[PDB]
Amino acid sequence: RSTLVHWFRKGLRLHDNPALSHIFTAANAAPGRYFVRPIFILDPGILDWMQVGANRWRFLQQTLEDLDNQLRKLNSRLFVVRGKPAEVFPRIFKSWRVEMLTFETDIEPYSVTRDAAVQKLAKAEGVRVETHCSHTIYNPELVIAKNLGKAPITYQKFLGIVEQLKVPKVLGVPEKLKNMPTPPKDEVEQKDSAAYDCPTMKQLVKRPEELGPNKFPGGETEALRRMEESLKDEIWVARFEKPNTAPNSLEPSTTVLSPYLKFGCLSARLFNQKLKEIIKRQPKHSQPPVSLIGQLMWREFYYTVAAAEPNFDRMLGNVYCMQIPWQEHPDHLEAWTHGRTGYPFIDAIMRQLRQEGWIHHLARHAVACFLTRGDLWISWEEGQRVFEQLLLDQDWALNAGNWMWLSASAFFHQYFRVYSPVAFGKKTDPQGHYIRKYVPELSKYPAGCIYEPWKASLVDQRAYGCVLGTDYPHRIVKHEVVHKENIKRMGAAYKVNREV
Numbered sequence: 495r496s497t498l499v500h501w502f503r504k505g506l507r508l509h510d511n512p513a514l515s516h517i518f519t520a521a522n523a524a525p526g527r528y529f530v531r532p533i534f535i536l537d538p539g540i541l542d543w544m545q546v547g548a549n550r551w552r553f554l555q556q557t558l559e560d561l562d563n564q565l566r567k568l569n570s571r572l573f574v575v576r577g578k579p580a581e582v583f584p585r586i587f588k589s590w591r592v593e594m595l596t597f598e599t600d601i602e603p604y605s606v607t608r609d610a611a612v613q614k615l616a617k618a619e620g621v622r623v624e625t626h627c628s629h630t631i632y633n634p635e636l637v638i639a640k641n642l643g644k645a646p647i648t649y650q651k652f653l654g655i656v657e658q659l660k661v662p663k664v665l666g667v668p669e670k671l672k673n674m675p676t677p678p679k680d681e682v683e684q685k686d687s688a689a690y691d692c693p694t695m696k697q698l699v700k701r702p703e704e705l706g707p708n709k710f711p712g713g714e715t716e717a718l719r720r721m722e723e724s725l726k727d728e729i730w731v732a733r734f735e736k737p738n739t740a741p742n743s744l745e746p747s748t749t750v751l752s753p754y755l756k757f758g759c760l761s762a763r764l765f766n767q768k769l770k771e772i773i774k775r776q777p778k779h780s781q782p783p784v785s786l787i788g789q790l791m792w793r794e795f796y797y798t799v800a801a802a803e804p805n806f807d808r809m810l811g812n813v814y815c816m817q818i819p820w821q822e823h824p825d826h827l828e829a830w831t832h833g834r835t836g837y838p839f840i841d842a843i844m845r846q847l848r849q850e851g852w853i854h855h856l857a858r859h860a861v862a863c864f865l866t867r868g869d870l871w872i873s874w875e876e877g878q879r880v881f882e883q884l885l886l887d888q889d890w891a892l893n894a895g896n897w898m899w900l901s902a903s904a905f906f907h908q909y910f911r912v913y914s915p916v917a918f919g920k921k922t923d924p925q926g927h928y929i930r931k932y933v934p935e936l937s938k939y940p941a942g943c944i945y946e947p948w949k950a951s952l953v954d955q956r957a958y959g960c961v962l963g964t965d966y967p968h969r970i971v972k973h974e975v976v977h978k979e980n981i982k983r984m985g986a987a988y989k990v991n992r993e994v
């Protein structure tokens with residue numbers, strides 16, 4: 495008896511999962527011949543390549559637990575294998591007598607390298623590998639081909655391409671396993687009945703004092719519930735305009751499906767199909783790019799450009815990226831990282847980010863403009879790295895693409911438009927309720943200066959019980975000075991890159 499193995503990495507879901515579905519149908523169309531091992535590999539190697547913060551570790555823990563629970567309902571289970579894939583797969587290929595391996599493809603460079611090696615091993619041992627592109631709606635390889643070998647570098651051009659492509663068939667959940675025994679314990683399982691169980695919170699989360707509020711539980715079950723909750727107001731969905739949603743409402747102004755899509759707890763193909771059903775129903779609706787479907791297409795766009803460039807997450811060697819002489823300022827980077835800039839709106843966002851692991855799109859705009867071309871003149875690569883640690887939705891291509899946009903390094907070139915760290919949040923939150931919540935030390939400042947506490951006299955600062963320089967920092971830069979200097983720096987960068 496040989497085993498069929500599905501390998502979860504992303505695609506942490508049962509629904510709309512062709513790679514996992516195929517494994518399950520095969521076992522049921524040939525009972526008695528196959529064992530089924532759906533595995534996730536706790537790969538130590540990823541930690542040398544990316545930073546994971548406490549909150550995102552908790553999201554994965556909750557996700558793996560839900561995926562185990564969901565598989566049990568199909569008379570299977572999740573097998574979480576500790577160790578490096580390069581060492582893990584030669585062993586299990588033999589100890590399990592693996593006939594077929596399936597997994598959802600990914601475009602990240604670490605994923606490509608790792609998968610190429612695993613496919614070289616599987617070819618050696620006579621293991622059949624079947625891979626499926628289901629993490630994105632469209633296959634970036636097919637988009638690039640249809641555009642004659644180059645990723646479209648504007649959104650509109652991208653949309654004109656994918657409109658001519660076939661939308662994939664969205665699958666349901668696999669059928670339960672008919673009369674399948676629990677595979678026999680292997681070398682590892684015999685010396686430890688729990689060697690493959692889902693990791694506890696204590697095993698994944700080493701810095702539990704950094705966990706924030708548990709607001710967005712991981713797992714396919716929660717993703718599907720939140721998706722259904724979001725689609726309940728069909729008018730809100732159909733008439734959604736991303737630029738008009740507030741960055742500083744106390745409750746999120748968008749779906750917060752991003753962590754779920756990032757891990758594949760939610761199929762973006764399923765979500766796209768649910769959105770198209772509502773739009774068909776609602777004749778007055780918004781259109782890309784501002785619509786909710788447009789938001790899914792931004793994800794597809796950044797995946798397509800990123801698939802073409804292995805250096806997508808850095809400035810050097812990145813075909814898309816303007817070469818800009820970013821400066822090193824450790825003390826300013828530290829203040830931004832920890833929300834101690836002295837600009838209450840910026841600091842509020844970075845504290846929401848650290849505590850909760852999600853901030854609104856235009857909140858990301860605000861703090862990203864501030865760190866880079868706006869105020870501090872620090873590389874977007876430094877902001878990407880903080881975002882990588884703290885975001886639940888941390889996504890290699892999306893973090894990089896948007897950081898390049900926000901820094902005027904690619905895709906976006908109107909760098910003379912600069913967000914004010916004082917005025918920007920006032921439009922949607924004139925009272926500063928958001929600031930009061932996430933910078934509570936300012937909670938007694940009135941609306942007239944809560945965005946600009948340095949406009950309060952010392953006497954008043956003492957009255958509000960928050961003296962700048964003691965209880966809340968002084969501004970680390972003066973926006974009105976630096977952003978003008980930085981516009982001139984950007985123009986000189988643009989000239990140098992234009993001449994080369």
Ligand SMILES: Cc1cc2nc3c(=O)[nH]c(=O)nc-3n(C[C@H](O)[C@H](O)[C@H](O)COP(=O)(O)OP(=O)(O)OC[C@H]3O[C@@H](n4cnc5c(N)ncnc54)[C@H](O)[C@@H]3O)c2cc1C
Binds near residue numbers: 748750
């Ligand atoms: C500096 C910066 C860094 C970012 N890093 C990430 C990241 O690491 N991971 C991430 O998922 N998004 C990232 N984004 C994009 C965007 O901010 C988030 O996708 C969005 O805020 C998630 O909130 P939501 O789920 O309510 O989105 P909604 O507005 O509800 O949109 C639904 C989905 O569309 C996608 N989406 C929306 N806006 C964008 C966008 N601008 N680009 C790409 N996809 C988009 C996501 O899949 C999102 O879940 C970043 C943006 C900026 C400016």
